[model samples]
Target: KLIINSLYKNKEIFLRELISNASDALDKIRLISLTDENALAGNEELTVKIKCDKEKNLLHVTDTGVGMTREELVKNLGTVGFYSAFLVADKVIVTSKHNNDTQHIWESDSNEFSVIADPRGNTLGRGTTITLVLKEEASDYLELDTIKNLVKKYSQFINFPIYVWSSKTVWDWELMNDIKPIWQRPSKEVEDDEYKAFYKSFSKESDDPMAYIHFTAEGEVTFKSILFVPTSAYIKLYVRRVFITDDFHDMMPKYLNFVKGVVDSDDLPLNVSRETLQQHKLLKVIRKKLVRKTLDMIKKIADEKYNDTFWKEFGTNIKLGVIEDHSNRTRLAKLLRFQSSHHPSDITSLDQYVERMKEKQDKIYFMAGSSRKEAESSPFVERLLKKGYEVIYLTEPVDEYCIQALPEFDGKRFQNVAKEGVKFDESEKTKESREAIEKEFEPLLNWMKDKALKDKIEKAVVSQRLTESPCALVASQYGWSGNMERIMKAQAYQTGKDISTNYYASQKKTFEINPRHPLIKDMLRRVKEDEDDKTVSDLAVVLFETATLRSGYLLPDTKAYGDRIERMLRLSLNI
Candidate 1:
């Protein structure tokens, strides 16, 4: 009762334990057969064979191992280790032979057992057969289908050939463990079509895999793995070819969930009950190895194929890895590509961007927007593009986050052209004259901040990058860009809370005016000549309002902005 209730928890464990014992015995004889030529004697067959005799409610497990004598059978069948046999069986009869006419019988009850010389002839030459008088409650094991599934669950990886009796119309023996584990095979010998066929059947996909990696790892745990690209998400794990689980989440990390295949290790310890796992730290080691190999596998894809085929499927996922995985960030960064000012439509990687950089250039300039056209035409990148500097365009919603999370690429810092601190490489005369203009514009900047668009902006400044636009709103170096603000505002709507004073939303931005533009110069002229004029203030307000809209920020007073625009039209038409 203690063994039944305490030691062996599941009822199905009895079959697994029995099959395990049978495999052990067969393995021993095969080892012996290798050293001693006559080890098997006349019994040449070495296999695990199971038969279900449901009419008698009995089960038979026979193994072609070195068989036991009458006394030896009684001795080996005593302990509760094998008492799980009696856990499912009320009575068990062990029949054995060591060749010659010396067949013996060991009969067992729940608590006691007895041995006697067999009355039957020597039908078996050298092996043992265990006949279980399966309990009334344990009758499920007597069904052929139940036994077959049971064998598959626990004994699928056993080295010895396991055959289950197929009692369908004819008494034919059915081979059970037939699928050879491909991970163990040599790479040179395995055909390409063989791998493609395996993936088609295993992943249940019609297309051939983009690529695959077959490798053997030999550090803390010796294991063989096969990783296939163009797959999801669940990597099947096996131990000595017996599949333990495919449900473990962290083995390949969440980012690389598209990687599919198997991880089989003979050295990893087992529960002998269910899944083989106990150490989290040990599995962490494997995760580190698997992640590196996967990234390495991805890096080897040809450039033409990488962009056209693989990137289209897993590009977002790879970008996510760049954001979330800090250790592999640089490696993941190298895999990243973006549409840029240098290319018309084709995207380029950061390395290529760096390669095309002007000599002594110190920063990687980028702009994020809803699309390429929106980003390319932004007032922020106007001067950068005008002066022939390449500006990377990030269009996807995740693209901005992916780039922001990265600190730098190849020792050069990232500069979002939408933010402040934009500087131009110019001579001393340009700097002296530019500062002179800043001083000249300083009064208008102060007037705009103090009286004109007083409460609407953080401050006002002379723009360094603006060309065709009158003015543009600029985020502080640390604040959210217009693109990010838009993204977060939409996300906030999903959170179901109408928001702001909303730290990010309430954070004021600089109103940058192009001193070189006509509207801005006219405003500067009007402000100086008539410091209290309505037209100057109205124009200042109008310019701020348009820049606010143009800079991707929503207006709080759209009605007033429209009213102001109407007044300007009225002034132009004599209304």
Candidate 2:
């Protein structure tokens, strides 16, 4: 009784349940006929039909296949079958006739039922017809259009034809569920247009699928499926030709939700309701396989279409997969695309970036900012660009997080050019020279950190990663980069009572000055001549403030920096 009222969330599913049972009955009789031709003596045609009487508020679902005997009627309906009718109707009356047995009738409400010999004789030659007296609340189910849609939605893939009795000028039985399950057939025999037509009809999508994979899974769980990478994610599930649920949570991983497909398994138990089937453990196994096959399908797409179409449509999904899917992160990472030093307009994959690495480069370098121009123009990349090293530009909001999730790609660890750990492959002579330059700049470095820009910087040092820029700010290896700081500060909730946020944002940055730049050379000479020179101190503070802006860090005192700039302009103009 409880199952009748709440087995399915939508009462319309009652039609689907009954139609599936009818298909099962037809399949049984056909299998029997294979062994003995006499099994189909009374009725050779296999079909399901629906007829509605609006005046009587009754819906009749009939099938011309196996008919139930008096004893089978009590067994099948007493437990599972007839109770589903109560979901949409007040009462159900089933009439049946078998080739080997006399006709019988069964009547049932939700609680109790009765069986008796049919006084009307053999109205049905060798089949069953279940008539539903629709309840007041479910009168809408009796509409001809409604019945046709339900059949198409849930049972269109059934092996047998389904028809609806209707009037089109003259009363006739119109074929409704005519589309066959081409996914069940061998992929080699199916044409490309057929797959396209199937996708368009099933998904209501206007564009062709970006990619598709049709194969049969075997071993632990056997099922035939055709998975597609559509312009967006969508999927439908079926158990032995009966549509179960399109919204099953575990059917596919959340990252592959953009994938569309049909998985039909004969191994599943169809006797249970859709809600109950969700709890089965085999489903998780199926989901794991589906996701693997989905990634394989995406991997097979032509490089051109994959970048222009698949990546453009579902690239973010793959990035999220890198963060969420630990089992498939490497596969997902291979599909990732980003703007790189090799191509200004075209995006390249990590694999492509690795292929183009300099002969001596040991790490995959990248810089992140809010825009392509800002990232490419960053002071951090000045020397790297001059040295002919390829650096990936991460300009998207989620780009940094995606890369952070991956420890390394192709055995090359990631290096953020904006951070302090950036190093270049240099000869022993060049290394010794760099050390000598640091030693020579020690006086200016000490004066800047102690007297000039005290409390403003953690330290000032001679820069190895600068060429054209006068100065730059570098974050610690574990501290937030300028790009990450921008993203975190914009989120008020992330800053509120968030200890990690306070720690990362409060970490002081290193002030790196180019030794060859004229400004730095003059400042060093002046500080050595007179350590208390006020003009040299102002120049140091101004250079640090300008470097903060150019290095992608936010200015904590924008107005003070602006006033200092105005004062410099007044002195230069001789005002």
Candidate 3:
């Protein structure tokens, strides 16, 4: 009694459990009758009928399918499904008559049960009728409308017909489960209108699904499934003809949680509890195929609708899919879209970016910032943009992490122009000139590193990436980019860099100066003539501070930088 009360949280599920068991019994008899017509001889109709007797405080659920004999009644009535009747009622009576056996009546009151020969002499020719004697507190179960709604709510998708005994409209068997399991039918036979209607009913949504896939898996495990990419994340799971819980999280990977549909497999174990899958191994197989089919469906959507509707709804889902699904990383990468310099307002795929690559460009270039305007106007992209190299713009926070997950795309490695390892294919003359400039700037670089800006930089050098910028701070090849710096800085309280975070965050950056800039040229001349000139020293520090802002690094001493700029302005105005 204690176990039955705790078996189901909601008392209404008692009806669902009973109806499901009835449907299973009917299925068994139908399968048997296919071989021997005598199996269903006593009753030809295979349907469930419900009758509510309010005045007598009784409820009757009768199914004209398979029935248990006296011995079978003693055994099956002690099981979980039969005991669920005690959840809402104090006493229960069962009347059954198998085709080859005599009629029997079984009665139970919570604790124990009794069985005797039926005096009615096989009133039910071939099936069982369960009668519930509702307790005074459970009087609502005797309402006709309550039972009808419960049947329609839970068992509306069952393959068998369910009817309710009605009186106000007419003394007739009003059908409750009128909707068929259309997912079980062939995809070619299902019309688009039917698909839309099914999606609306299944998801309880007013709009149609963004996309859907209807296919049958044959290998390893055989099952029929209809998966939908709804306008939002929602899905329902069903095994065989029984409706299972829709609250399962493992039904799909977290990335594809937005996919909503139904999976009906005949091979799954129906005997186990609803929360569990009987065969764990087979469930994993089914999950794999479902994800693949969902992606396939998304890939097949029309280009216009995919970009405007599907991507607009689920773009982040695919980017997360790339980061989380290692086995399918390549496939997910193809679906990734980002804003780029090649297009002002539209986003482009990696394939499109690669097709537009310059003849000499061996690496894919990208820039990340707080927005499209920030990224396009970044000092790091000045030379690249001048050289007509298209740079992918990553504006969203997840965009950088998504690209980092892919080691390379289409045989070209990713190059974040803000960090180290940015390179160019210089002509022989250009290479020689660059080397000469490096040698000529050696004295100034050493002075800046060893004396002038000693603690402020790792080293200073002539840059190959700069065009108009005077100087830029560059991180190590493995260190964080400007965008990453901003993200981490915002979470300072959460990150609490003890040693590792402090070490990475404190890693001194190389300061690169443009040799052609007039300010840099004048500073170099003054440094060569006299390294101790306060005027050149102030100018050098100001230029470094200004470059720090342009290069996406935070200014540690804003007050000091501000004071220095004020003094320079006063000197320029002859104050």
Candidate 4:
């Protein structure tokens, strides 16, 4: 009695256990029926039946499917580790009959269970009946509402028909758990509400998705999937149908972490191990299709709503896609949207930047900054915007890696406006004049790069592109961008990875200048007066520091910077 009560303390679990057993029974019979029409023995309505006797405190669950033999009964129930008829029942009896054999009965009273061939006679035609002797306190399991909730909660979505053994004033036998799995259906045949309903029923999510991609993968592996971008972000990795983890590994690309969906593919080889499949040819094909479909799905969201709704929630996913998914980077790049100089608040797609391209525009223009406001205020965007060239503004930290992964879009290269490389579509004559200026300024540029700021800059060159800011620091084509520097530093602070921070920070940047700026003109005058002028040295340091801050980078020596600014301010204000 002690084992029985302990095993079945929660009377509600009994219904679920019985329904699972019944499902197993139905599956066996269905498999047999597939091969032998006579296997079902003419029981066309394959279902489970439940009955309750309140006064007697007994519950009977029956299935018109496969029946267990006496030995099979002992092993399936009495031998399983989780089996514990001892939990809830004072006594339990099971009667089973199959077409090929005589009936049998199994009885258990917690400590021990036994099976015996039917003594009185073989009465059951097929299947099994489980009779549970309910406890006096656990008598409430007989209630219709109680049974309804238990069935719906645990077995509602089971493949076979499940009946709650319920009754109405005029009739009895109300079947519960009738909901169907929609993922098994074709994509085109399903409607929007169908998709939304399927997501709600399967994922237990409250809001509708930002978008969904549904497709069937065939060839070596065959699977059907409906991937979703939820209205909100998911915090972890989802592997398989089971929520094993969300720690962002190889399951989905890190940037596509926000995508939520069910991928049910018959092609997935379940028996193989994770390590084996990590190198499988089929997995690569699957990953390739998933990334492309996801981008296409995002492309379909209505433009205005895509920005205000979809992009607001998952814009970073696309940016990350560009950075991490090299094979699909070009496709993902077109789906990328950034805050640009053209519109203060609008998110512009690469295609939009291309459409607004200026005549003879040879490159796609962009400027990276700490924020939209900071990007707009940067001197980098001044000449580009003023010259009628649309410039994309990257405000997020990961924006640079994204553009770097995608070297070009639609045959147009990307030019960072914050660096020394900025140039108009210059004619041959104009290009020659700019080269001569660089030759003339080589002495001063080399003085700063080789001697004074040797540790900070890779080199210094004459101002060819800058229009407003006197100077800016630039990263090499393959080096980390200014925005990438900020992100790496922020990660260092959060994760305490000082070593990584030092490595990226130690990398050198180019010192670029705007030849036309007043500060540049004054600095040249002061330097010519005396190359060793103390004030000129201070001004050069100040320009270098300011350039660091404006070029989507951090000032490593912020405290020393404040002191230098004070001295410069004092000199300017005549203090």
Candidate 5:
């Protein structure tokens, strides 16, 4: 009562509560019919009816779907939120007549409920009706506009038809709410206006869908789904003909969070009073179909407009789908888009990346960061971009994880340019020069490995990869990739879980130096001149630390790095 009175203190919310209940009951019966054709007991039309009796201070919500029995009445009505009539009713009288069972009437006054066989024999067959004995002060609910507004607000997206019971001068019974169940209509019959109006009616948004999918699946189970990728994102869920929650978990995967639509299955049972689906197996079948349809809907987007609209709103969702939905990771990867050298203003699809690849381009190049600008300017992408190769810029937090789960796309593998073993085609002369430099630098590599960065490096090696920077840090094949390390460290820093994986967090990385660079040559000369000089070691550590930041990796230790920098600043100032 307190939740109903305080949580839903607004009396107007009563309409939302009741409409949600009707929609839920409708969903249950629809799910059942996937296997049981007689689930509805031959009632072709499933509808909820609402009526007001001003003189009696009452509101009646009647449904032609599943109705409750005595035990069902206690279990269902006894739970206030599901059987929403409790939201406004001081006393709720529920009457149900099923084709398979005797007619029954149940009543509740908030705290407890009682049920008895219907004293007034069955007039209505195969469903249930709820009559709310409204509180005297809450009688404003008797208005038709109040009821209609509520239906439009919460239950407009429901698959079943909802009607308000009323008497006109000529007709004894009529529906006040006139919108057809568009989700139940064939896709060909549904118009743009219909979808737009429904979205505006329920979502209360001005923009139309970025795109939508309408298809019916057949085989192990049959279900119809109409899903929309709204022009903007929203969080909400509606099951059957009711609002379950907007915050529903995995109603669709988290990646599909931008999809605002409905999945209605006629294969599940809806005849129970509890308003819960009876078939879990068939529901899973429906969920699988819904996801496939969503993918197809996105794929159908015209190439010219995809990046402009669909990708702008839902690209993150596709990336996230790669991480969370392993079964469909490849499909999601195909739909992925990224900023790259080929197009500075536009995003390229993975298919485009694959199509534009040169014969020798065996790997897909990518860089990750907190922003596109940061990714493009990172040392990892400096050479790749300069060499005219496109590198996918992953800016979202979920992007690295998503790409990590995808070992390969099409025939091409992903190469995080910041990790170990990055190589490109080189002529025999260039290769010979590279090997000679590594041989000449062997003493410095051994000295650094044994003396300077020994505790913090897997190995110091002459880099064939670096072109501009003096040095860059690279992770081992099985070690934490720079992008992954940045993500893990940021998460740990924010949540205070740093030491939880301190070993991995503190693991050493290979220090790779550009042998051709002038600074590298000077450093090598200075190291050879004074192998015991502390300043040379300080410069190496400072250079190594600077390369880490420039290469898009986080520094593991900050205080030591800052102290080294201050000492270098003092030396530069001749202090």
Candidate 6:
């Protein structure tokens, strides 16, 4: 009892050992029939079958094997191939028949055992069946799933087929070792449907997949496996020695692959490539390794960089890429932020940002600038802010282009306050008042166009919106913004080139004049009073440069801007 209890160290070892011994028993007959054919005289088939009766608490291992004779049972019964039975059982029962002998049952409570005639004669013909009366604590072994898994672990992949009498639909034996994994096979001979079915069984996942990937490497001597694609995809980069990324696109990388995130090497160099990222070989080798190696990396680095850093890296810009491909996925673009004048600091939301807009205003008034303060200092936006409309200061480089042709945010269009679309909400009386002023300064739009600021003025309109500044340059509503110019020039430098602002083109101009500014009103009056073209040229040209300074575009003349401002000081010094 003491030896039997401690002899089999593992309890699960009991089932594995039983099946292995069952194999030996069947193989003994398999050997004899090959040599003489006498062993096959009484029975023909050789196999192993396992079944359990939960009601009886008895599980049997049956093999069509060489059977023990009457007395041989007495000797072998005191034993242990067989010893593993007591590891999970309180008793063992084996029933067998010899080729020319009567059927017999040899059973044990293990303290001692008994041998008896089968009384019911040669039903088994020539085989042994070991029935384990399992202990209640070992009931799991009787479970069909448990039995199948155990057989799969040890007896699977063996030459013999294994069956468990699974109780489903109707109690019948079911093949336990039926599947040989498709990945282990050489791909060329394997059919696509074979790979497809195996993908489901191994993953036990339910979606109908997009592709079957069976990979067999020829001679790292080699590596073999398979893979899949979904209705969605991801950037799974495989870097050697460290790190991950939802980045590095050669593994057929996409800006929108939705999956989450190795290699062995010699001869490869450096951790990061520079001035070059630097090689042609890197692109070729890494593309495959990253494809294969990264198909492998998808399970990790998910927590490391995917959450903390990746989204923060590109949020305001995803809207730009989203619209660049807005044939679909416009809904995701709706979730973005812009700097709004309603707050000093927090990036504003699109839904609520629109909610705060005036009910009658169908335009989301946005102004573009290189920085937040430049936006706040905009001479164009001063009247918009004074007139009580909130302005969205699009301060990031991406903010301007992303909004370029955006149809609307909430069924409301975006209006750039710096363009030719300014509309002031004034009463009819003030419209008449504005009309009288426009006609009064209609001659002023002329002198500046015809005489003073000739080349720069395409059409000079008396500014209805300006309250404090002399004037500002406004582009055609279809024209590019100065912020857009910055990105193109900035992109030029990043690729190692210098482009002058001329190669950067512009819209034909409209010169906007501040109807109330002292300088502007004085110029109009000076021309009305027959002031010399020389005095007004100095005056009007200086004011045009002033507008160019406050306007978004880059200025052509740096020294002349200072000279004009200096000459204004020269006259104002009052010698």
Say which candidate scores most in lDDT: 2
As for candidate 3, its clashing pairs are 233-258
Provide the global lDDT of candidate 1 against the true structure. 0.81
Q: Is candidate 3 or candidate 4 better by lDDT?
A: 3
lDDT of 5 by residue, 313-376 (tens): 7777787788889888888888888887687778888889889887787888887778878777
Residue 491 lDDT (model 3):
64
TM-score of each: 0.70, 0.73, 0.73, 0.65, 0.68, 0.49
lDDT of 6 by residue, 1-575 (tens): 67645664655878777777776677556644543557876678767888878899989988888787888888876653678778888889989887757889998886788999997888787888899988887678888778888988766433355778876658777777643334444668887765555444324354544443444444332334344544332332222322123335443434334322212222334344332333546445544443443334322324434334333554543565445555433453454566778878766656777778776777888888888998888888878788778888887766776776477776878888888897777789998999998999988888888888777767899886678888888777766566665677667777737454554254446888888889887888889887565768788887787777678777778898788777778777974
Backbone clash count for every predicted candidate, in the order shown: 1, 1, 1, 9, 15, 6
Off by over 4 Å in 2: 1-159, 163-180, 493-501
Error of 4 at 6 (Å): 25
Instruction: State the C-alpha lDDT per candidate.
Output: 0.81, 0.84, 0.82, 0.72, 0.73, 0.67
- Which residue runs does candidate 3 get wrong by more than 4 Å? 1-180, 274-279, 494-501
Q: What are the runs in model 4 whose C-alpha is more than 4 Å off?
A: 1-47, 52-157, 163-195, 206-229, 234-296, 323-327, 427-460, 478-481, 486-509, 530-532, 552-575
| lDDT (C-alpha) at residue 405 in model 5 | 90
Tens digits of lDDT, candidate 3, 1-575: 46644664666767877887788788767756644757877898899988888677778889987899888988878754666788888788999998778999999887788999999797898898989998787677667767778888767556789988887735888887764588888889998887887787656677988888899899898888888878764555556655555766788899988888888887776555544573467888888888888889999998878878888889999999999988778888888888899879888889999999988788999999998998888878888888889999999989888998999998999999898888788889988998998998888899889887999898898887788888899888988767888787666646654443553776788899889989888888888898888888889889899888888878879999999999999987986
Stretches of candidate 6 exceeding 4 Å from the true structure: 1-253, 256-313, 324-328, 489-507
lDDT of 2 by residue, 1-575 (tens): 56756775666778767887888788777656644768877787888988889887778899987899998888887663446778888789999988778999999886698999999888888899999988897688877667778888867557688988888659988887754678888889999887876676567676988778898998889888998777764567777776666767667877777777789888886766566688777777788889888888888989999998888888899899999999999999999999987878899999998888888788999999899999999899988889888889998988999999999999999999999888777789988998998899999999999999999899998988889899999998978888888888777455554544486787779999999999999998899898897788788888899998898878888999998888788889996
lDDT of 4 by residue, 1-575 (tens): 34444544454566667787787687667656644678877367678888878878888888877888766787876641235443556678888987677789988875587778889666667788888897676677788777777777766546677776654556467767663445566767788986786566446676787788778777766666678878887322112322212232554677887677665554545434445545667666766677777778888889898889887888888787777777877777777888887766878888888888977888988877777888787766766777788888887767877887877899998888754456577889988988887776667787787666767788887654556668877777657767666677777877857555476567888787776778876776666677877777778888898888777777888999999999878877986
